[PDB]
Ligand binder design. Structure first.
Ligand SMILES: Nc1nc2c(c(=O)[nH]1)N[C@H]1C(S)=C(S)[C@@H](COP(=O)(O)OP(=O)(O)OC[C@H]3O[C@@H](n4cnc5c(=O)[nH]c(N)nc54)[C@H](O)[C@@H]3O)O[C@H]1N2
Ligand SMILES: Nc1nc2c(c(=O)[nH]1)N[C@H]1C(S)=C(S)[C@@H](COP(=O)(O)OP(=O)(O)OC[C@H]3O[C@@H](n4cnc5c(=O)[nH]c(N)nc54)[C@H](O)[C@@H]3O)O[C@H]1N2
Ligand SMILES: Nc1nc2c(c(=O)[nH]1)N[C@H]1C(S)=C(S)[C@@H](COP(=O)(O)OP(=O)(O)OC[C@H]3O[C@@H](n4cnc5c(=O)[nH]c(N)nc54)[C@H](O)[C@@H]3O)O[C@H]1N2
Ligand SMILES: Nc1nc2c(c(=O)[nH]1)N[C@H]1C(S)=C(S)[C@@H](COP(=O)(O)OP(=O)(O)OC[C@H]3O[C@@H](n4cnc5c(=O)[nH]c(N)nc54)[C@H](O)[C@@H]3O)O[C@H]1N2
Ligand code: F3S
Ligand code: F3S
Ligand code: FES
Ligand SMILES: [Mo+4]
Ligand SMILES: [Mo+4]
Ligand code: NA
Ligand code: NA
Ligand SMILES: [O]
Lengths: 822, 135, 822
């Protein structure tokens, strides 16, 4: 509708980091009784804005989607307004479409959050019902205990978030990790986005370069930005908007010159390595001109060849830092030999013309006239992380970066752009092997599987094999449960345990919402998100912020760290009752009343005297951070690691990593690695050999992840009622499809469905499907293939397309117009 | 206007310590045609005010067809003689059984520790027989 | 919140009959543009009410729940206000809590109807996706056709509504019945509330008395009202409120006296035959005094004994109409012999003291001082329809009524109170046997099952056996579908059909909502309810009204009759294509563009020259009814059957049936029937022998049916988050339960769950559980037992009760206070 209730001048104001992407944009949450409002005069409302007359452009970001009315546990009603902080350095008052919806996605009884989990849910053999928390713990802890006593920890499976922000963060990763690893001590654990306990960044870390090694200010200071496997307007909006674009526009030139009096700073340029022409390519060309953008539209999976050709060329031209290499690196001469690739071979493999390869090197590595190498920030994400051999691509890319001294200089960095926020503090993983968890589950292993803060039915690789197996195993438990009548909780535990000896699996989901996991889950436990709890996390430049609690969770929904404590204390109590003092002792250390307690126990204990082994993004100075100190810091927080604290200075942190040439390896040097080109994996190549289309996949600007909130939003559902597939118009004509037709996409791995979205910029025999979605799951057609560390090539699959027919309704209501701005 | 809110009056009811447990006080809010009751329940409830968080207040007009309901001290409910709707004073006017489609409206009370005063400051829910709570 | 938008004086106003119960209360729907409103002055708003000052009691029924904002197919937003008609004779401006929410339960994208089915949904082996109507028809018609060609009609199953109002009515019952019976010609059809193609009222019909034989005015004229197996304050609210209570209060005395100048009319009295003390009993005592209410609190299942003892006694006293018996009945002397039971025997079986038995006969049957028998209306519902041997109870009851001439006299009737509204027009059932459909399905019969406007997962007798079987058979089809890749619709039909030869079953639901049927369904089709379509139906006095369309359905949702036409035309086209002219001809006669066409083809054709056999509640004068004539009638409509029409008079109909003593039998006489007392059925007696509690079940005033809308209503879910079980406080103490504890309820038939609701009025060893609900399905513990016509004894089951635990959140938010007003 057509009006908004303004926040009163004296309204309560708390800090809130965005729930969603890595950028970690700062917001303020205004909270006030429903029957009060602000006046239009700027000094009579909390915004300080003059609503007596039209506001100019950029004065505010404020829509009805940024407002709500919450009903608290006391039954009292409060207006809320969730709006970007103008003085936050991250976003400077910018809000993406995703963060802009936070108010709407706060829990209310009648709004978009109406189907929030509010109590334990139990599938009692043949129907969903509520149950109590104590019954849920008796069943869940009971099973875990039984499994520990009979099978050991290897019978207990998890797939759990390791990330930051909403459904993650330092309190939550500690809580879950302490439970899984210190208490239960299970190695049968995967991560939300990948099917083993591993890293996205094995190669770069082992080369001595952690993947978040710079500041967002570095994107302002760069001569050149590379965006490799990365659609940052859509996936990291406000980093792109607030930092990248001002550089491309010339707004940061005078700051470069002030820092470096004796260095030329040409107009900044941008290079995209992406098989696909994305909105980010289009918008870059709009802002900077076609002459300052290079789209290296590589063949899918050919990143390694690209970087080996560039590395070879910059070495042959001598566009490298030989003093840097000599003082601070190891293995260069070996990498020159193993990685040798001519520009002609590079061009044949990539499909990129030799002139474009040479130009990219010239922009990026050839000394400027003043003598200094260009400041080239190399930013990468899932196009290579989920690319053709995660480990080898990073090896090849980092070799280029290290040889060109593009780490440790301002305006440089070889960095992840990131996904979620970060907020990792955990004990070490208690196994000595990587385990492909999905494969284990498919093969019939484990008694109990918990999805915690994730939904692999929508997001696993080879997701169809996964769903099939889980549904069937779930059904066996359902069938066994239904023969019970009048059983105690203990008897039920035995019935379910027995069913798991005959192929069954007990499935638990700890979540905000039922999700598609409800098709298989036997138990669902209600969690709480930021604003319903305090939560700490850091963004892509390691900036740690506290998100303040300002409202109650729905019903008995709890902070994930506190659910973990609940589980630990239930297990402890069972062991104490069973007279097993040693097993009880493993479940000590969860005497937690609030999320802060998890912060004190994890983040703040890392590297302290008498602490156990803790792997924390805070490092050993994490104890200097407190909730009260973060509050005083505001949405600016501090860049980790913290270097000092006092009352007069606040938290003082770290802008850029590796500025003195000391890397995270045994000898302090960065290590070059061999990067062989072996083509595509045979599993993926077999799909490519049999089927017509490359089934690229990934993000839409407007849709967040598995659409857990978005599925309930009427605007989102009207815009994207179904997952879409970008198709070349000529391919469309060949298949007799147009916008709003439905197609089956299929291969040897699976079958799924999408609505057709003709896109002129898509190449013939290539496609692009929205990933993770609630209607048409893309991942059914991804292969089982992973690299050496069990990293999937999610961006590597091929399949055929078959027309189902025309969805008239989609044609009447959905725009199929171009999403590439020109 | 601007304004999205109704202009509720601030009306003194009494001081909290004058209220006896389960002995309803009558007052009118937000005008003399809107009969209301405040009662000390004797035991805390969500959103109760006063020293023992137990004082609640309501419009007594049935939200079905508007008959003045009567407070039953033995059940702590408001009962309507029209079509036998009954509302729970301890569950924010939740309808126990009846023909209404709206909970009994709550009179929002400010409690000031400094003065011991209870002031009616608003209504949560729509009073029967009104386009808006404030006429 | 705290205000309402008034309808402008010139607002559009249409007629709507309440969507829900039998009473069929009249409402008006006001529709106007969102940005307009009425003035508070009475002549400046559509209600004609003065909102410049407080309104007095009874002036209006109006809350925010009675208002909404709809978004039409053109994108334009309109205020709606759905309020009771003050001049409708049925309700005189009363709205129940159920009808009062109709505005809220209209479809809007953000409201309670947000999850309405908007397009065909398909379970594509391992995920829910949208599909097109044409693909849906190809798959569904394809399957039906394949099954017809290979198995014949016996392979195609339905459970379908037969009722009136929302999700029924004359258009819809004709459409479905023509499809099932004239076109497909399947006998494998059950009804929404019972598991065969039968009647609730076989005995009374066969004895020559259709079950809706009076007017609501008859309740005003009666000396005595019996409510047998009937909770009418909760189940037929506004008939009880607007008709019964005015009689008990003495408001109708002067009208009785004006009609019958030489007849005494004592204060009216009311008799309840119900094992349970209900709200209705309490409220009758409040209104009439304890001295004018008799609660005959029989032992469960003993109604036949009750009526045989009363019949015997009134015969022995001579409190019968011997001239009526002699002129207008057959078989009396036989029934006196077969049904003979002493008041002592009656008292021992029923548990009702002899004094109370005598008093009920004295109030009801003993001549008044003026010479005339009391006018005693005998009203019955599901306490006896789902009672101990449906056919025998009606035999016993009707014998008493006929002998006492309590049919055909004003102020009398032996009538159903009813459930839904009525609206039946169908071809005759195409078999010569009753078939227990659920048993057939559980035994692995049928290729395809369609649930149409019903949800037997929640409402079958022996519902647990049903769900078990259907989920497993559904799983077989799911498993077979998932091996397909790139299959045409025709190949998929073969895949599924093959799976059904290995125990599978293809399941379709045609619904407003997914419901629990989504756990098994392969296909779901969106329907439209009244106001999104035109719809005709009649109430418990046979009063037919038209509910006018005033808004669009969600997405591509369609009237059920038009869904039936869609199916029939798809089948005809398939047959025509396959060169099968004879088979194509069976699917003729569905050339329908609007619901009115279904009205013309069914209701209006009954009994006309060259019409096929049609069974219609309109009778052979149904052709005199048109939509335009009903419009002119208002919410008053006309009582069926219509006797005359002209332009000047309107529709003139029938107040009461059987006033000349001509019954619906071969000879025109009412026929007495033998009623043996044989105890409880052995299957039920075995449960009673094994287990402690009688598991009575039925309605709650606030909850409608399977809570398909109510499940989305925040108020309803806060009130009744779980199905509740009324238990005796002493029984409670013995089980250590109180309000808000959860219990398992269980027997040999199944296990289910309920929240404990202590109720002082419940007898020891008796309970009462809400039926049909979305959280804790009661029907799991009902037996498979049915009477000779396959009518279940849903109110006849026993089971034990076990504490699960305390739900603290239920204790915090749910009232466990008394629902029996005093
Ligand atoms: N084909 C294909 N597959 C992919 C990818 C790809 O590019 N291609 N990308 C991968 C990537 S990068 C990722 S990150 C994964 C994402 O895979 P998932 O992690 O499965 O998906 P998300 O939507 O992040 O899951 C968050 C879930 O947690 C719930 N949730 C939200 N807040 C909380 C909270 O506070 N607590 C709890 N307990 N639950 C919460 C949400 O409702 C939702 O169910 O998908 C991966 N899968
Ligand atoms: N709007 C929105 N933003 C999000 C998310 C979201 O769901 N919605 N999710 C967040 C998360 S968890 C993550 S992980 C990030 C994802 O951020 P990105 O990785 O930026 O997003 P994607 O869409 O997965 O993929 C990036 C690009 O990889 C390209 N690509 C495909 N195959 C190849 C290949 O072989 N090589 C190369 N070089 N490129 C290839 C695709 O064409 C695509 O444009 O986004 C985060 N931000
Ligand atoms: N234990 C026990 N069991 C009982 C009974 C009992 O007393 N005790 N009672 C029995 C009785 S009397 C009844 S009536 C049954 C009820 O059993 P059902 O018929 O299964 O229940 P309803 O809730 O009436 O079913 C209506 C369904 O149709 C949908 N619907 C609503 N409107 C429409 C529409 O216009 N078109 C279509 N296609 N769908 C629509 C609703 O969303 C819902 O799923 O339960 C029976 N079961
Ligand atoms: N509020 C509301 N009203 C509705 C409905 C709704 O869901 N909610 N549903 C509608 C429908 S479809 C129907 S069928 C009607 C049903 O309306 P009713 O049949 O009036 O309601 P029920 O609660 O099923 O059962 C009636 C009574 O039967 C009693 N009873 C149990 N066993 C026996 C027995 O052996 N003998 C006797 N004599 N009594 C027994 C129970 O104690 C109960 O009070 O209600 C309609 N009205
Ligand atoms: S608003 Fe949120 S979605 Fe990312 S761009 Fe900013 S953190
Ligand atoms: S409003 Fe509705 S539910 Fe029945 S009592 Fe009336 S027709
Ligand atoms: S006027 Fe109060 S219950 Fe109807
Ligand atoms: Mo990610
Ligand atoms: Mo019914
Ligand atoms: Na699939
Ligand atoms: Na069950
Ligand atoms: O019914």
């Amino acid at each position: 509708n057509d009006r908004i209730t303004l926040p009163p001048a004296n309204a309560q104001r708390t800090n809130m980091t965005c729930h969603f992407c890595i950028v970690g944009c700062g917001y303020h949450v205004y909270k006030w009784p429903e029957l009060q409002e602000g006046g239009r005069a700027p000094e009579q409302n909390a915004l300080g804005l003059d609503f007596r007359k039209q506001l100019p452009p950029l004065a505010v970001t404020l829509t009805p989607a940024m407002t709500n009315v919450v009903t608290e546990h006391n039954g009292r009603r409060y207006n809320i307004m969730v709006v970007p902080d103008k003085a936050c350095v991250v976003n400077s008052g910018l809000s993406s479409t995703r963060g802009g919806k936070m108010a709407s996605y706060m829990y209310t009884p009648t709004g978009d959050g109406k189907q929030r989990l509010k109590a334990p849910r139990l599938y009692a053999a043949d129907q969903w019902v509520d149950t109590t928390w104590d019954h849920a713990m008796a069943l869940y802890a009971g099973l875990i205990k039984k499994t520990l006593d009979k099978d050991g920890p290897q019978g207990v499976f998890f797939s759990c978030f390791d990330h930051g922000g909403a459904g993650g963060g330092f309190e939550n990763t500690w809580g879950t990790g302490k439970l899984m690893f210190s208490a239960i001590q299970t190695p049968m654990v995967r991560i939300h986005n990948r099917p083993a306990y591993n890293s996205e960044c094995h190669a770069t870390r082992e080369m001595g370069i952690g993947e978040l090694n710079n500041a967002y200010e570095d994107a302002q200071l760069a001569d050149v930005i590379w965006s490799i496997g990365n659609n940052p307007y859509e996936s990291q909006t406000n980093y792109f908007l607030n930092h990248w674009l001002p550089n491309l526009q010339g707004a940061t030139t005078s700051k470069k010159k002030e820092r470096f009096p004796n260095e030329n700073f040409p107009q900044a340029r941008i290079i995209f390595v992406d098989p696909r022409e994305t909105p980010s390519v289009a918008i870059a060309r709009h802002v900077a001109g076609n002459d300052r953008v290079l789209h290296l539209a590589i063949e899918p999976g050919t990143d390694t060849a690209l970087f080996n050709g560039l590395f070879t060329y910059v070495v042959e031209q001598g566009w490298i830092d030989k003093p840097f290499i000599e003082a601070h690196t190891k293995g260069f001469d070996d990498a020159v030999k193993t990685n040798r690739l001519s520009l002609d071979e590079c061009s044949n493999i990539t499909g990129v013309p030799v002139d474009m390869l040479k130009r990219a090197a010239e922009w990026s590595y050839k000394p400027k006239a003043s003598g200094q190498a260009p400041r080239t920030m190399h930013a990468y994400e899932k196009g290579i992380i989920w690319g053709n051999d995660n480990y080898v691509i990073q090896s090849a890319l980092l070799d280029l970066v290290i040889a060109t001294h593009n780490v440790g200089r301002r305006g440089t960095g070889c960095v992840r752009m990131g996904g979620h926020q970060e907020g990792y503090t955990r004990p070490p993983y208690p196994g000595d092997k990587k385990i492909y968890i999905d494969q284990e589950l498919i093969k019939g292993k484990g008694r109990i599987m918990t999805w915690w803060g994730c939904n692999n039915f929508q997001t696993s690789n080879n997701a169809q094999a996964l769903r099939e197996a889980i549904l069937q195993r779930s059904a066996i438990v359902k069938q066994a449960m239904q023969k019970a009548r009048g059983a105690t909780t203990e008897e039920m535990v035995d019935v379910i345990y027995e069913a798991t000896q005959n192929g069954g699996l007990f499935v638990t989901s700890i979540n905000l919402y039922p999700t598609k996991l409800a098709e298989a889950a036997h138990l669902m436990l209600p969690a709480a998100h930021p604003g319903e709890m305090n939560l700490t996390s850091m963004n892509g430049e390691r900036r740690i912020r506290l998100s303040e609690k300002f409202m109650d969770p729905p019903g008995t929904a709890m902070a994930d760290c506190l659910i973990a404590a609940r589980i630990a204390n239930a297990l402890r109590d069972m062991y104490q009752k069973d007279g097993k003092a040693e097993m009880a002792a493993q479940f000590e250390g969860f005497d937690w009343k609030t999320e802060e307690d998890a912060f004190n126990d994890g983040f703040r204990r890392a590297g302290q005297p008498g602490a156990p082994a803790i792997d924390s993004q805070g490092g050993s100075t994490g104890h200097l951070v407190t909730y009260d100190r973060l509050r005083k810091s505001g949405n600016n927080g501090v860049q980790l690691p913290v270097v000092s604290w006092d009352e007069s200075k606040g938290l003082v942190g770290t802008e850029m990593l590796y500025t003195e040439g000391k890397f995270d390896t045994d000898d302090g040097k960065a290590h070059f690695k061999p990067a062989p080109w072996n083509g595509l994996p045979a599993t993926v190549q077999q799909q490519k050999d049999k089927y017509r289309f490359w089934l690229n996949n990934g993000r839409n600007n407007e849709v967040w992840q598995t659409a857990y909130h978005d599925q309930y939003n009427s605007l989102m559902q009207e815009r994207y009622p179904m997952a879409y597939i970008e198709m070349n118009p000529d391919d469309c004509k060949q298949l007799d499809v147009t916008g709003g037709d439905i197609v089956e996409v299929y291969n040897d791995f699976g079958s799924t469905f999408a609505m057709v979205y003709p896109v002129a910029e898509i190449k013939r025999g290539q496609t692009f499907m929205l990933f993770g979605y609630v209607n048409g799951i893309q991942g059914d057609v991804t292969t089982d293939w992973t690299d050496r560390n069990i990293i999937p090539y999610y961006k590597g699959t091929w399949g055929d397309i078959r027309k189902v027919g025309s969805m008239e309704e989609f044609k009447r209501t959905v725009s199929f117009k171009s999403r590439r701005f020109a | 206007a601007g304004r999205t809110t109704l202009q509720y009056p601030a009306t003194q009811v009494s001081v909290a310590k004058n209220l006896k447990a389960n002995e309803p006080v009558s007052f009118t809010y937000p005008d003399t045609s809107s009969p209301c009751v405040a009662v000390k329940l004797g035991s805390p409830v969500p959103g109760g005010v006063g020293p023992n968080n137990d004082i609640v207040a309501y419009s007594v007009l049935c939200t079905h067809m508007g008959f003045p309901t009567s407070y039953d001290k033995s059940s702590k409910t408001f009962k309507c003689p029209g079509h036998f709707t009954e509302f729970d004073a301890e569950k924010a006017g939740q309808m126990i059984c009846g023909q209404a489609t709206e909970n009994l409206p709550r009179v929002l009370l400010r409690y000031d520790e400094a003065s011991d005063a209870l002031t009616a400051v608003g209504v949560d829910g729509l009073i029967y027989g009104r386009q808006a709570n404030v006429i």
